[PDB]
Amino acid sequence: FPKESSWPNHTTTGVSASCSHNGESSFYKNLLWLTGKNGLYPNLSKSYANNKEKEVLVLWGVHHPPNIGDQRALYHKENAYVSVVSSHYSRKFTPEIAKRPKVRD
């Protein structure tokens, strides 16, 4: 995709303390910690077709906040599913957890 011509309804300025570069907060370079936009989070159905080039590899992740408060105040609604689908890969993720220990602050 493009960075700013494919997600116009989802802020992508993903900040995190643990992923600091030189004392300033940041995130990964190959991924994008979407956090909604304008106090909402529209249901996205973005796709891609590997008809061009060769056997490409695709990377993604799901974030499990450490409490219901982060879910409610960040994605603005609980019970959020992630369902990647392809010809031979159609499993779903339903991350809903309310506690964790502390690792790497």
Add this chain to the structure above:
Amino acid sequence: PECELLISRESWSYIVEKPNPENGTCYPGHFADYEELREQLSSVSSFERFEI
């Protein structure tokens, strides 16, 4: 439906598959533990097709 013309025998020593056969699962999907089933069904000494 395309594979119902099989030779309905009773016992076999090893099954045979065409390399990448065309008419496999007519409905598209994922066969869970397919490889385990294939390894188990490789040999059978008595194969009585019942209906539960």
